[PDB]
Every structure is written in structure tokens, then in C-alpha cells.
Amino acid sequence: STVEQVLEYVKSNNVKFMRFQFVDILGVPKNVAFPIKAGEKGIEELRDVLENGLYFDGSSIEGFVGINESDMMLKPDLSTFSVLPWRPSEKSVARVICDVYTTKGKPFEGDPRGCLKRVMEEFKKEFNGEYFVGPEPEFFLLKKDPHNPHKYIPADDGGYFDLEPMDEAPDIRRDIVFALENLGFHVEASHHEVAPGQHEVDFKFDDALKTADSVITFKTTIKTIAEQHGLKATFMPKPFFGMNGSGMHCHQSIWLNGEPSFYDENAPYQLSETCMNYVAGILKHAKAIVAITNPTVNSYKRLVPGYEAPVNIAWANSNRSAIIRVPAARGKGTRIEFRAPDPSCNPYLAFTVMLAAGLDGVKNKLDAPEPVERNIFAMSEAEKKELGIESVPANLKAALDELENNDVLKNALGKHIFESFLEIKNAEWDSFRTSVTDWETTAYLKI
Amino acid sequence: STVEQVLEYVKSNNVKFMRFQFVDILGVPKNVAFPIKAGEKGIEELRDVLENGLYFDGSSIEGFVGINESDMMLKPDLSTFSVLPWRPSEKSVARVICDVYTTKGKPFEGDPRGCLKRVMEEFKKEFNGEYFVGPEPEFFLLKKDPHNPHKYIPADDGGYFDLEPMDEAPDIRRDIVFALENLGFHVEASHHEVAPGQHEVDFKFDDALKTADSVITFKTTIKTIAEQHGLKATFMPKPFFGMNGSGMHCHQSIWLNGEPSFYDENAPYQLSETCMNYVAGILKHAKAIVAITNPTVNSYKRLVPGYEAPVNIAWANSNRSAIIRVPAARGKGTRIEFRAPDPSCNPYLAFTVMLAAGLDGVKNKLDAPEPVERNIFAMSEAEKKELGIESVPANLKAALDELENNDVLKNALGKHIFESFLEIKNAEWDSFRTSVTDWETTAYLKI
Amino acid sequence: STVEQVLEYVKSNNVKFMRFQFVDILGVPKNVAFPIKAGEKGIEELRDVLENGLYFDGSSIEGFVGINESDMMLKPDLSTFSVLPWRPSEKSVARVICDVYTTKGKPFEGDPRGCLKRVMEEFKKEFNGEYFVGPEPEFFLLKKDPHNPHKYIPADDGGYFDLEPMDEAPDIRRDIVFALENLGFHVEASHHEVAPGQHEVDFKFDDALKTADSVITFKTTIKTIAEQHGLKATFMPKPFFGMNGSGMHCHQSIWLNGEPSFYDENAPYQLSETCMNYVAGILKHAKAIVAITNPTVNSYKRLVPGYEAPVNIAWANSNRSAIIRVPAARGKGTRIEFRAPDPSCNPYLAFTVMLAAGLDGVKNKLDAPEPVERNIFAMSEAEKKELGIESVPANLKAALDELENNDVLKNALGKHIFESFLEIKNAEWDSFRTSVTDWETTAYLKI
Ligand SMILES: O=C(O)CCC(=O)C(=O)O
Ligand SMILES: O=C(O)CCC(=O)C(=O)O
Ligand SMILES: O=C(O)CCC(=O)C(=O)O
Ligand SMILES: [Mg+2]
Ligand SMILES: [Mg+2]
């Protein structure tokens, strides 16, 4: 957190490299290594670079600035210092997540991290609240197909919570948990998931900024540790058809004045009015939130309408068929689980749109619908239409049009992020709709 | 720096070999190893060879002397002593960069290192200045193509500043930085570059001679360490079509009387008249400087007119589309970035022509044009012609003809370097224009 | 020549398909097959399509019309009727070369065949002349490389005029000559040429239109018969480095009032003033004619300045070192051989520019230089500069700039052909200068 606490770690623990990490518009991490020199001269050089930051070409980063105005800076947040465990111990490598700033020393408008800081500071100023998030990012461990090395397949034919040798990843998950604990994570649980080769490593909830910094670090840690064990980890929302997809369920709650505002001992389901207003806001902008929280073309193969998925815009208690599920835990742990996201989204922008839509419901005091305790997959389309259970868009372009017409998310993301995201994703969608797919070749080459 | 300091290190550190290194006309390093014998007899033998120098066949070195007058000598610069880290630690190998001298003990006219010393001593005598340079030499890490071992491809599908495992070179860059630090380099930053398998390792600026000595050692260090990790590093300006090329942006500035002459607190853009006169001189001889700073046929595939490259002869503040870019840093760090060079050039001759053209503008007090803050790539050829933004030559022969007619660079390089360079490069160009290329076979074999 | 003569041959010889052939701007032949029906109804259908022609999409043809004005027509030239021998004999396939016409029934401006007809009709109207041409189009017979099937090599290690089995093409040349004789050719001689696998099949001279129609049919006849004998023929100007290239020497002469105007019994070298004026005109526009007669990038690897080639702009008697050679035959056979062309050029445009530059000399009565009887390759560059022997451009772009500034060839080709040719060839040149060649990879990957 303090300059001296970082410099004295570097002196005693023999740190040789400092990675200045950040994220592009799509949530891909980017960094530059700075070599620390020995003695006081090296520590005073590092002090200048930690306080004043360093320059970088912004035109090469996705969704940042043009070539004619490329000069940018990185101001390190010292409260995010950590030692990368996958790197060597002697002459160790360390990281410090930064905020992208303009040449004039002003926070960059198109920065995803600064976008989340802005909305959290605005929430803390207006309501004196703290936005807490706890995600469940699932992933797949892959190995080369023996019949064809150009394709990849799942690492094992394991099921949900299966034991070894059926589950061939206890050693891979073991090292992942050790690596995350060294990075400052409070790991809660680890196990095999429903689909073959699928796994899930959960971690404790925290404020949206610390949680988004943890999601970026979690994705790199899982990919780099898998390569050490000769495997390849992917956070693709649906790498294989006919089996479960990778989902990042976001358990969330807001605490006004250091108290659990979502809990109300004397109320229906022990849920406060603030909780219901927040849920109403998420359900209102649900068709627009999935553009950010599900930004890939493949996301709409897991989150597919008309088929078993968290596509139905409705809330329910202890029911995994609806888009929102209220876990049975009460008191401090009273929360809502937004099941629509997948680990392909930028966490900084995902928590921004969720907090903005949720706070829109709290500010206007919007009325939430009744909980659909029944299984929604077993219901017919005519029955769901009578109840008013709408579905999330069927494809990426359908979600981008909903995001474009939404003014609540446009203001939260800002003109720079909102317009660049739509422009990048429309070019990505155009590339998909023009390409001749393998499905088409299989179905129409015979005609 | 002195004879005794070198012999004191050689004695204690068990140095067993001394490489007498130098460079040919094209900037290719050349050296001869000397074994240091044990005891006082070995130290006194090494002493005699360090002061009086040693002989070598000059006819075999490129652009040096004929067979009928081949006897030459190497006078070591004792301050350039360094232990090669890629060589063993026990019975360590050391190097000493030398100045090529004639049999009569007079500095050789056709020596690139002596050419840079001459112009720097002339500048220090006339203006009491110090010419500082800080380059950014980019390179590619390659691996054999699995589909064909005779061809090479990039080591990874990484982008700008990408993180591991997408960036497969943190271990290669780690050892590069450690090796350069042992050689006396002040490494500033290291990261992955825009094109696949492309990387960039930056180092602190220094006087042109110490910087040119560092560029030669840097190129060898990067190539030798890559071979240790089973890869092959290349400083080719454009090894692959459709992706960024290797560029060596030269950040430079002159300090008259130990003061930053380029900075002026009370002036437009906080840039002095001396800075504008220097920029005017570079832009004047821009068509001739690219012959030396871009001496390969392949250089004009990266630095290609009509396409996105630093080809437009103009200057601008924080704009990477023009040939010169003035970084936003001010005070001591006030400088100009000549973006046209690539790491294929001889650094000793590149800094000589840049200082000569720049000083031609300072001596005559030439008027620089207005800065083109707009993106020059988006401009049309008719618009660029109205403004007067000329382009650098389209090929090697076009640049050699410009260098031949330029009298400012002819005098700085000297009759020996100027004529031998043109003769060697014209034979190189003739070999290219007569050879039947793979592009021609693909396009015209069908006709 | 008339509709009835063509329908009478079709009736008796059992012709089942009628190809309507023509050429694009680059000289590539293009055609559409029309199946002839049996009985009177089929002959009356064929009569209608022969008299009125047929429609086709002009936007798909190179250098013709845009997509918004694509409707075009083909008016058959009945004199160019011929039977394709390589096609089956029973239910034979006949061809008829056509003139491209606009929807309004007016000759198309951008038609290469109509361009040659226009200048020949203008010459016959103004001077009452007949432009005769007799080319020598050389070609290479290739076979797959046994060490690598992806590459091609020459069919045999034969030399000039060599005998079998050293010359492995007597059977291939035999069938070529039989096929050309059936198409109406007057074949003069056939033999093996200097380079390995290179051959030459000569044919009698005729008026420029009949000769250009023969060059197109010859190129197709050579390639189709080569594929029948398991080989691949190429008219590439220089498929391999270090061996002779394919050249199309154009023997030409003009006959005013049915008399050999180039011959003069009482004159120096027995050559008339009209011959000298014509030669002066070719030498004047020589730098611009090579843009059309040598339109490929590869053409400047055969026609390479500074090396043994017909690059020297000068004329001489029985000397193959100069651009023009006057063969020793006199009387009717008095002619000039323009040695610069290669079989990669469009014959219709090549004969147009040669006749236009030649007639420019006749109209203005330009003075020709003295004949250089000495070998020009043995001369030094300083000696050739004193005599005034200039050289043809070193590359495609250098020739396109000369063609652009030439007003004589601009008028002969017309605004449509002149501008489209320059536009197509500049895009072709830009593709070459941007591509990374195999020569560059071999020479610079090591640096
Ligand atoms: O497998 C896991 O989920 C954690 C590691 C573990 O339990 C083990 O090492 O056996
Ligand atoms: O990756 C770099 O640029 C330097 C090396 C490094 O940071 C590492 O060893 O992880
Ligand atoms: O080979 C030739 O040049 C023509 C054909 C021939 O003479 C032959 O059939 O042997
Ligand atoms: Mg010796
Ligand atoms: Mg830096």
C-alpha cells in the first residue's frame, strides 16, 4: 500500500523484475517488465518509477488511443503488489496493477480499471456503500487429440466432484491453489465440474476493484500452471457442444454504512426492499448487461435461448434455472447470484454494468417481479409468455443493439468505452457472419 | 579504464581469454581471441598486447584494405572492457573493443568506430557539446516451421505487452536482461512487441560512442542467448509480410556546455531554437540518411512509401506517423525520435550521419517546418503534396543515389567509407535486381 | 471470311461447339462456348449469333468496365475462323476471335484488338501502307522437381539446336507444329533453344492483326499440347536465374503502295530513308515501349541493364547486342528486329505502340543514329555515355513512369487502355515491392 513497504520487500526478498500490469478494453492483461538494479541507486530508481509511473504506446493497445495521440502513462496502485509464484524464487519477479493515465496526468477515460473506480467512488460518495462481488470462474483443462494433434480435447472423462483416478486434475488444482494463496487469494474450495475436463476454483468475495484484480490474476495463474503440467487451460464459454460450458456466476451484495443492507430479519424470504430494488434493476437492463458480461460469439452457444441455460429473465430462491438465484445463506452472507456471465468478459466492465443497473433500481425504487420457484426449463413458451418471463438475446449482435439503445450502461462505461466496445464487437460479429463454418460445409456440401 | 585496472580484474577473476573486437563497414562484429597465460609472465604478455595492440589481415575484412596493403593493427579502448556472460564463469572470457589503425600507427580512415570518434571530437572542439543517443532495437525470436524444417516462423502468437503463456519469451528476455546488466548496460524496460514473436529490450541513453558500442554487444547478446533456448533471433527489418517490422527508433539530443540545449521553458512546445535547427537539418538530408540507417534491400519493405511507415519527411509532437516524433518528456529528457532506422544499420555510421545532418542545420540556422499534429497516413497524396510532405526513397538504389549526391554525409563518413559503402551496396542491389524471386515465380509461371 | 463460308464448313465437318474468343487488357485470352444445334434450326440459330454476336459480363474481365455499366457484346471476325485440333475430331470445336463492342453497337474503346484495328486503318488511310510483323516467341517446357514436387524445373539439359536424346522435346514440338498447321499457321522452323528445356517455334510474318491473332492462339497451342505430354509450358520472361530468358523478337516492316518501302538498292546498307526514319522513332520512344512490350516485374530480370541483354538503345546490322538488329536478307525481306519484347506482352498493344512510335519517326522524318557494329556488352559505361547509347529502364515502375509521360503511345492506346494499364501495373508493382522475397530472407535472416 505504501511506497516504503514495496521498496523494503524488494530489498530483503531479492526482487529483480517489476511488471507494470493493466488490461485492454476486452479484459486481456498487458504488462512491461522493469529491471531493478542492486543497491540504493536501484531502489531510488524504482521509487521514481513507482511514484511517477512510466510511458507506453497506447495505439498498440486495443480500444485505447489513435496513432496521432499515442503517448500514455501507467500510475501503479501500490495496494495491489504481489509476487508471481510461477516465476523463479531467487531473483524473483513481482507485479503492480496500474491505472492508465493521459500525458497530462489525468485518468484515461477509456481505462476499464478507472471506469470501475469511478462508479465505486460515486457510489461511496452518494450512498456510503461498498459493492462486494464473489465470482465462480470455471475453466477447461485440455490435451492434444491423439487421433489428430491439431485439435484439442478434455483432459479427463470426469464428472461433478469426481475422485481420482477418474478426476485426473488433483495435482493441477493443488498447484493452482498454492499459487493463488501466494498471490494473496483466500481460496474457498476446488473441485471437478459437470463436463469432462472442466474444473472450478472458488475464492472469497471482496470489493469490486479487488475482485476484478483477482479475476485477471486468476485467469493467468490457471493458464500458466496448466502449461507447466503439459496441458492447456481455456476460459472459452463453450469449447465443446453437448457438454456444460464455462460459467462465472457473480454472487453480489451492497453494504450501506457497514451493514448488510440486503438482509431484513422481519421480511419475506428475509430479503430487504433494497435487495428487491437492486434485483429489479438487473432484470430491467438484463438484455443490455449480457453484451458486456457475454462479449463473445461463442457465449451465445452456452447462454442459448430455448435451451437449458440461465437465459430466462427472472429471479428465484435456490433455483438454478432462472438468471438470478438467491442463495439460502442469510445475515451477512445475504446475496444474489447473477448466473448469466462467463469468464470471457472483462471483470472491470462486468462489475460496472451490474452495479449501474442495480443502483438504477435502488435510486428509482423499482418493483421486482415474484420469484419463479418452479423449474423454468419445463415450462412451455406460451406459459412463459403469459407470466412475462422474457429471454436474453440469442446472439452477440442482438445484445450489442440492446447495449447501444441502453442509456444507463452508456453513462457508466463512458463515451470512450461504450463506442469502442461496440465498434470492436461489430467487426468481430461481421467476421463471424461472413466466414464459412464447418457446420455449413457438413450440412450443404452434399447439395 | 587504465591498463592496471584491467590486469587487476583479469588476475583475481581468473579471466583466461581476451577478445579484440571491432566492426566491418556493414557493422558486422569481428574479433580474435588471445589466451592469457598464468603468473606474471602471462600478465606482462597481455599488458604488451593491450598497449601496442595486435596485427590482423585487413583484406579479409569487408570495406577495409586491398591484398597488396593488408597489414593492419587494433588499438584497444580499455574502458570498453567487459566479461562475456554467455561464456563460462570458470576461466571466464573477456572483450575489449578496439580502434583499427594503419601499420604506421595512425587511425584507419575506413574504420567506422574512428569515424564516429572523429566527428564527436570535432563537435566537442567547436561547440563544447556531447551527442547523446538512446535506441530501441527490436528483434524477432524464431523457431523451425513444423510443416517444413527448412523455413523459420515466429516463436509465439503474442501481441504488444502480452502476458504468459500467450507471450512465450519471459524466460528468454529474463536471461537477456541479466546478460546485458553484467556487460555494464543500464536496462530500462523489456516486453513483447506488436508482431508475433517480436520483442523489444530498451536501455539507457549515453554518448554516441558508448551507445554504438552497446548496440553491437546487444545484437550479439540477443542472438547467442536465443541459441541457448533452442531459438534463432533475427534483426531483419521485415522478416514476414503482413506484420510489423523491426525498428530502431533513435532518441537523440545535444548538450552544449553541460546544459540541455534542446529545452527552452519560455518557447513554443518548450523546444529551443537549437532543437528546431537540428530537426531542420535531419529533414533536409532525410533522403540521404536512410541509405546508411536503412542499408538493406529488405529495409524498404518495412520503410515502404505509400504505406503505414515512418516515411513522411516531417516532425510532430507525440505522433508516430511522422519520421520524427518529439516525446512529451521535458527538461533534461527533451529529445527528438528519428523513427526511420532499423537494427540492420551500422550504429557507428548511423550516429555519424545523424549528427552531421543535424549539426548542418545548427551551423546554418535552418528553419524547420510546422509540426504535422494530424495523422499523415489518413492524408491523400494530393493533400500531402500541397503541404510539402516529401517521402523517403522507395528502394535501396534510390537511397544510394541520394547519398552519392549528398556532400554533407560524404565529408562526415570520409572518402574511404563513402565510396566503399556505395560500391558494396550497389553490388548487393545488382544481385537483388538480377535474381528471380519467389513472388515472380508465383505470379508469372502460369503465363 | 463471310457468314456463308463459316456455316458451310460447320455443316460438313460436324462442328458442335463455337468458342467466341477475345483478350483482356493484359493479353490473357477469354472465351464462351456456344453449342450448335442439329438441322436447319441450329444453322439459323448459329447464323443469328454470328451476325449479331452475344452478350457477356464486362466487369469480370480485366481492364474493361465497372459493375454499374457491365453489359457488353462480342462481334465475331469471320476471317479468324479455325478448328481447335487439341479438342476432339468427332463433334469438333471451332473458334472465332471477336471484337468487343458496347451495348449501343459501337466498338469498345478499351478493347486491345480494336485498338490495333484502329491504328492499322488510320495508317492505311493516311499512307496506303500495310504493317507486317513476324515474331519469335520462345517458351520453356517444365517437369516437377523429383526432390520436391511443389517446384518446377526444365524438361531437359539440352542446348541450342541439340539432337535427341539430349533434346527430349522432338515429339512435343512435332505435335505443336501439326496443331498450328491445322489452325492455318505457316510454320517456318522449330528447334531447341540455348537454355535447358527452352524451345522456339517460328512462323511466317503477316499483317499486325493476323499476326496478333496468331500469337494468342500460339500461346494456347503450346500450353495445351504440353499438358497432353505430362509437361507444363511457360512463357515467363525469365523462369530461372543463370540461363537465357524467353524472348519474342519482332521482325517488322511497312509496305507503302504494295512495295517494300524499307529497301533501297542505291543506298547505304541497302536501307531506305523510310527505314531509318522508322528506326529513329522506335529508339526515341524505346524507354516507353518497353512498358507495354515488357509488362511483368520478371521481364526486367531478362531485360536487365548493366548485363548481357537487348537493353542498349541503338541499331546495328547482324549484331544481337543492340536493341534493334537489321537482318542481312534484302529485297522484299528487308526488315528490322526489335529484340526487347518477351512473350508476356499483349500482342495487340505491342504492335500498336511499335507502329505508333515508328510512324512518329516517318511523319516527322527523324534522323537515326549511326549503327554500332561493335559488341556493346564489351564496352564500358563511360565509353557508352560518350557515344550516347542510353539503356532501357531497370524495372517495371521505371518503365510505367516513362509510358505515363509519353504522349505518342497515350494517343495510340487511348485514354481507356493507357490509364487502366498503368493502374493495373502499379498495383502489380506495389504488390512486388511490399512482399518479402526469398532472396531477402536468404541474405538478411542471419543479421
Ligand atoms: O484437488 C483439489 O481440488 C485440491 C488439491 C488436492 O486436494 C490434492 O492435492 O489432492
Ligand atoms: O518478461 C520480461 O520482459 C523480463 C523477464 C521477466 O519479467 C520474468 O522473468 O518474468
Ligand atoms: O522437333 C521438331 O523441331 C519438329 C518435329 C520433328 O522434327 C520430329 O518429329 O522429329
Ligand atoms: Mg596475431
Ligand atoms: Mg519503461
Numbering used by the authors:
A (entry chain G), B (entry chain H), C (entry chain K): 2 to 448
From the paper:
Glutamine synthetases (GS) catalyze the ATP-dependent ammonium assimilation, the initial step of nitrogen acquisition that must be under tight control to fit cellular needs. The dodecamer is organized as two stacked hexameric rings, and each polypeptide is organized into two parts, a shorter N-terminal domain (β-Grasp fold) and the remaining C-terminal domain. The active sites are located at the interface of the N- and C- terminal domains of the adjacent subunit in the hexameric ring. Two loops in the active center are critical for catalysis: the Glu-flap, involved in shielding the active site during catalysis and deprotonating the intermediate product, and the Asp-50’ loop, which binds and deprotonates ammonium.
The complex with 2OG/Mg2+ was obtained with and without ATP (MtGS-2OG/Mg2+/ATP, MtGS-2OG/Mg2+) in a new crystalline form and both were refined to 2.15 Å and 2.91 Å resolution, respectively. Both 2OG-containing structures show high tridimensional conservation (rmsd 0.279 Å, 441 atoms aligned) while deviating from the apo resting state (2OG/Mg2+/ATP:rmsd 0.694 Å, 374 atoms aligned, 2OG/Mg2+: 0.631 Å, 371 atoms aligned). The structure of MtGS reveals an allosteric pocket perfectly suited to accommodate 2OG via specific salt bridges, hydrogen bonds, and Van der Waals contacts. Binding of 2OG leads to a succession of conformational rearrangements resulting in a catalytically competent state. The repositioning of the N-terminal domain would clash with the next monomer, and therefore a domino effect occurs in the hexamer ring upon 2OG binding. Overall, the transition between MtGS resting and 2OG-bound states provokes a compaction of the outer ring and an opening in the center and middle parts, leading to a more “opened” conformation. In MtGS the 2OG binding provokes a major displacement of the N-terminal domain towards the adjacent C-terminal domain and the overall conformational changes promote a restructuration of the Asp50ʹ-loop, leading to the repositioning of Arg321 and the Glu-flap, yielding an active conformation.
